[PDB]
Design a protein around this nucleic acid. Structure first.
Ligand SMILES: [Mg+2]
Lengths: 98, 82, 95, 106, 106, 95, 97, 87
DNA sequence: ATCAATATCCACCTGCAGATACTACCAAAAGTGTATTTGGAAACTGCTCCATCAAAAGGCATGTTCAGCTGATTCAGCTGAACATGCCTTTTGATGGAGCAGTTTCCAAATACACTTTTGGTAGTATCTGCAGGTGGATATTGAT
DNA sequence: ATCAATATCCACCTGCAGATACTACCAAAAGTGTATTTGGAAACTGCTCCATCAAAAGGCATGTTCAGCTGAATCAGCTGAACATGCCTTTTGATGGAGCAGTTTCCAAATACACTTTTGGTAGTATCTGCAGGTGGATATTGAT
């Protein structure tokens, strides 16, 4: 019964997803979220297909970048595990918050 | 079996993003925290896009509306016009 | 000697309306002057970009308003918009 | 002869705002109500900053608003703080704020 | 009838650029040189980027440049990375980069 | 129906001058378009500002040059000013 | 003879300089530095005195802010002593590097 | 003209105490000894960047005198808008 | 170490989603001929800016002392990585119709231009007042005991 | 806790810089009033392309197991804070000189503007093919023993 050690798949997945450029959130759920959020600003709205793909590209690109920074924050604190506080510190310093 | 739209952003998806991010190991509270962050991002962008839409007396949000909303939020995006 | 204008006067009137017993240092006034020129440019800029995006050659109060909404945060926006609209309605009806 | 300001009931100069909209190359044409709206918007923001700055002057037992009072006002108000998040007010200093862990004992 | 582009030695369109300058409200008037200069700067940078993109498709055994190639070419060039530091290249992914402390020891 | 203007074309010529045996995807060309528009807006706007700061009414190649220097990094700015200067000379030296 | 313990004057200084707004670098040195650097860009420059003051207001505000961020990075690593790596991490996440 | 004293190593006029004072206004309680040189490096870069841009405005106006406005405009370009000196 | 489990790389194949190629208008560059506009080239000011000298304090450099912080070390417990799959949500592809976009129309509203009137800026003098910086002197705060 | 050192606080008090106060001149706005031009809202509707949905697709929720990471605790070493001491360098405030921003007045050169050719560039259409996946088998990496 074979079994990879904790970390070994993770690294494998890093090497994999850094190599590729496909989106990583599933479309329909991202799309429904967009509409939920937009409903709160104006009702009965329609979205060009490419207007939703633009959003998805932007978010994914944002979050991946935030995760790079977040990861540097965990590493600064001598950890290798990213916690919320790391995400909060990165946003704080980016000027997105606080 | 009902569910929050935001929870449509699944733990495995979030994890993938983090892996593109170079992250090796993830606390379990990140998923909720990430969802929060992502929501505030889309809120801010969408608010500004929709604002462009209403200015144009349209009922459709266009790629340009988004592009312009991105630009002014300092998140300029290439590849969708403009 | 050339006339160098500023918003010093307007700023001082508004100060007297909100704190009639309160003065302002010329440094502080310089700051206020910077502030108004800055917000002026930011709004005027957004409106310009806006008109252009919509192939209009004209910046009307409608473009100012959308700019304001793009630029200001929540409650500042709401209030700015009402004072704006109020000043226009009144102006329009006062010739 | 009525100024366009009094017509609109503003302290801020509508004519001057109109002229600056022209000379700044913002568009071919400027609608008659843009400078009215804009001057009103600026007047409102300046009224708003002055209110909080005044308070900050009175709190420090002062009659005269200096740059520190603008800075205290702006930075203690969420929305002004955001609107002016990438701006420096000369002679403003910063808000008194020490991180808890740095204080003595437990 | 000779295109100003061919006079200038350029592929990029001096005329179009002249026009975009007139109708983007940048200034009351526009020099004759200004659109030639600008067009040439735009062509130059286009070149430099296509050049490096080119090489990156070549390196990946490919003849048709895709957004990815543009990302590898920009983020591996110090100066283009700086010029485009606040820009997202759709469908670009990110550079292979793992923090050394995360690599397995043994 | 109506025309949608782009640079997708000048870009293709430059590609052929630089890598004659290499093609480009639809998306890729979309990016290159955004690129050209972006840099265009950055340089024009900065040029617009210079001209206004000096109370001039005209955007010459000198305003473009200065802009390029302010906007681009070291070497990039520099291979670029030369190219731009070269084009102007050649366009001038052309009956 | 009397001694405040390590940190106790540090906290006093924070409260003192957070309460005031005067420039914290000496004027004449700052000015020499500004002239050195510009001279290396272009010889025979003169400066309006208010140009130099603007530069100084702007530098001090930039460093004070960077020291705040630097401090947050030290505290995040459970320290109270700011180190170069703290300045470095803050600058990277700011996009300065 | 006749002479004009050579400027060298003026970065050292940004002394340790001055730096410690900036850090206190930034809330910092304890400071590693290496911070002083690191801060001088960071400061030099920020000044070079701003001055480079200001002087470019100066040269473009064909002046020999750097003004407050020249500085103010450089600051804004660089996303460090400054109030209190004009503009 | 060797050995099996499993992931990864590399060579080759091939249909078609997506390039490139071609055609044929036509909006918008280019050419032409006047009709403004502008950015200096000279020719002077009055500044700010630079230099420099002297006095004086106010802060800087330095060395010593040791409090307490940092980083090393050790370790137990808790918490996230790895794991197999059918249930179910997402993906794909086919079809009405909402509304974006094309087009035309016309007047409320814009620019333009030449007067008339006013206000906001400055500069000359004049007065005033808030508060910076100094003074004790009564109330904490800290740290040694 | 109690006691002594010293930082802190606050409140009153005079010199004075920076603020407010006129005064008055005026030059440049801003406003007023026709004459003239047009941008874009309004209305009508053609036809993309967007919402909706049925069948096809394949990613994710789940619960268990324990590897190894995190956070707590202890501690030796040495770094950085505090502080006294000696005195250099910045601050402050003069004085002169001039290098240079800041104006104004005249044109030659440059750029805008109205009008007509003459394409270059686009949409719509027609061929052409790079490579996304598929398979097969060799090879590399990981982990157990
Ligand atoms: Mg030198």
């Amino acid at each position: 019964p074979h079994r990879y050690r904790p970390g070994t798949v993770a690294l494998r997945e890093i090497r994999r997803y850094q190599k590729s450029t496909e989106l990583l959130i599933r479309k329909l759920p991202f799309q429904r979220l967009v509409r939920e959020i937009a409903q709160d600003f104006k009702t009965d709205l329609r979205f060009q297909s490419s207007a939703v793909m633009a959003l998805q590209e932007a978010c994914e690109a944002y979050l991946v970048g935030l995760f790079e920074d977040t990861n540097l924050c965990a590493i600064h604190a001598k950890r290798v595990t990213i916690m919320p506080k790391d995400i909060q510190l990165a946003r704080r310093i980016r000027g997105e918050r606080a | 079996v009902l569910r929050d739209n935001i929870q449509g952003i699944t733990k495995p998806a979030i994890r993938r993003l983090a892996r593109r991010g170079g992250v090796k190991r993830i606390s379990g509270l990140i998923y909720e925290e990430t969802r929060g962050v992502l929501k505030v991002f889309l809120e801010n962008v969408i608010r500004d896009a929709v604002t462009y839409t209403e200015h144009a007396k349209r009922k459709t949000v266009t790629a340009m509306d988004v592009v312009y909303a991105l630009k002014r939020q300092g998140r300029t995006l290439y590849g969708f016009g403009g | 000697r050339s006339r160098k204008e500023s918003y010093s006067i307007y700023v001082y009137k508004v100060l007297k309306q909100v704190h009639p017993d309160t003065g302002i240092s010329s440094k502080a006034m310089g700051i206020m002057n910077s502030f108004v020129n800055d917000i002026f440019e930011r709004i005027a800029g957004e409106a310009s970009r806006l008109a252009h995006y919509n192939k209009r050659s004209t910046i009307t109060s409608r473009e100012i308003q959308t700019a304001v909404r793009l630029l200001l945060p929540g409650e500042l926006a709401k209030h700015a918009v009402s004072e704006g609209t109020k000043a226009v309605t009144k102006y329009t009806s006062a010739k | 002869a009525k100024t366009r300001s009094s017509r609109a009931g503003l302290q801020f100069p509508v004519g001057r705002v109109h002229r600056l909209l022209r000379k700044g190359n913002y568009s071919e044409r400027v609608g008659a109500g843009a400078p009215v709206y804009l001057a009103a918007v600026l007047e409102y923001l300046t009224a708003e900053i002055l209110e909080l700055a005044g308070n900050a002057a009175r709190d420090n037992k002062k009659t005269r608003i200096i740059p520190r009072h603008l800075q205290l006002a702006i930075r203690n108000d969420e929305e002004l703080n955001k609107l002016l998040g990438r701006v420096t007010i000369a002679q403003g200093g910063v808000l008194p704020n020490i991180q808890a862990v740095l204080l003595p004992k437990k």
